[PDB]
């Protein structure tokens, strides 16, 4: 069952990479918006929003890994 | 063969971390320069540059997973 | 109980640590941006930058070290077989 488990890891690498890519675009955006704003109350909402968004993304990736792990177990029998 | 496929997976994980590491120094550089500058046109150019550089890095990592996908196929048969 | 199933969990453990690294770095980056908006003294800001940089390097090196473990542990599993 070597090819199946291998395909699984390739899938995983893609998930984590996409998460990494989405977090990067989030950080470029947080820096861009912060440079644009002067009001600190307003800047704090952008930061608070990026933070929870980042948290959603990390959690999504965490569940994907958990699912890849469970699927490995079944393929293991 | 299993050992070769695992070697492939270790290689891939390392390259994904390398992309993560390069993005982080990029993000750190972007914040540093933005704190240094006041002119927004110049700041937007720093932001634009870091962004395209981030995509290049992201695109290379995507190609690497793709290579790893091809290579795994060849080895399993 | 396969050698392959054990190699597989090694990779699962490996993806987690790297994600954990990415998560930690992401929080370092947001904190640095937060403090940057809060401060006007450049000396202070540059110190916060140096701190995040050193912290980010350690996290990356911690992850590089775990990869070296996975690689070595994987080798060990090679002769070990069903």
Exposed/middle/buried for C8, CB within 10 Å: 0-12, 13-18, 19+? Answer: buried
**How far is B68 from C13, CA to CA, in rounded Å?**
19
Domain enclosing residue A57, as ranges = 1-77
Report residue B52 as tokens.
Answer: 């395209």
Cα angle vertex A35, ends A32, A38, to 5°?
135
Confirm or reject contact between A56 and chain B (CB < 8 A). no
Q: Experimental method for this entry?
A: X-ray
Could you tell me if C4 and A61 are in contact, meaning their C-beta atoms sit under 8 angstroms apart?
no
- The DSSP result for B18-54, as a single string, is HHHHHHHHHHHHHHHHHHH---HHHHHHHHHHHHHHH
Chains that touch C (3 or more CB pairs under 8 A): A, B
Could you tell me if B34 and A35 are in contact, meaning their C-beta atoms sit under 8 angstroms apart?
yes
Confirm or reject contact between B44 and chain A (CB < 8 A). yes
CB atoms closer than 10 angstroms to residue A65: 20
Nominal resolution (angstroms): 2.4
CB atoms closer than 10 angstroms to residue A29: 16
- DSSP letter at C80 equals -
Is A35 within 8 Å of B40 when comparing Cβ atoms? Answer: yes
Under 8 Å CB-to-CB from C36, ≥6 apart: which residues?
A34, B31, B34, B35, C45, C48
Give the residue among B9, B1, B8 at the shortest CA–CA distance from C14: B9
Report residue B70 as tokens.
Answer: 């091809």
Domain count, chain A: 1
Among B18, B28, B29, B47, the residue to mutate for chain A (most A Cβ within 10 A): B47
Compare CB distances from C67 to B6, B10, B27 and report the shortest one's residue. Answer: B10
- The DSSP result for chain C, as a single string, is --HHHHHHHHHHHHHHHHHHHHHHHHHHHHHHHHHHHH---HHHHHHHHHHHHHHHHHHHHHHHHHHHHHHHHHHHHHH---
- Helix locations, chain A, DSSP H: 2-36, 40-76
Confirm or reject contact between C2 and chain B (CB < 8 A). no
Instruction: Report chain B residues whose CB lies below 8 A from the CB of A20.
Output: 16, 19-20, 23, 58, 61
What does the CA dihedral A27, A28, A30, A31 come to, rounded to 10 degrees? 120
């Amino acid at each position: 069952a070597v090819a199946d488990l291998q395909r699984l890891n390739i899938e995983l690498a893609r998930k984590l990479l996409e998460a990494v890519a989405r977090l990067q675009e989030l950080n470029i955006d947080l820096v861009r918006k912060t440079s644009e704003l002067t009001d600190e109350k307003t800047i704090r909402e952008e930061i608070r929003k990026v933070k929870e968004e980042s948290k959603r993304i990390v959690e999504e990736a965490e569940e994907e890994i958990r699912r890849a792990k469970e699927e490995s177990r079944y393929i293991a029998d």
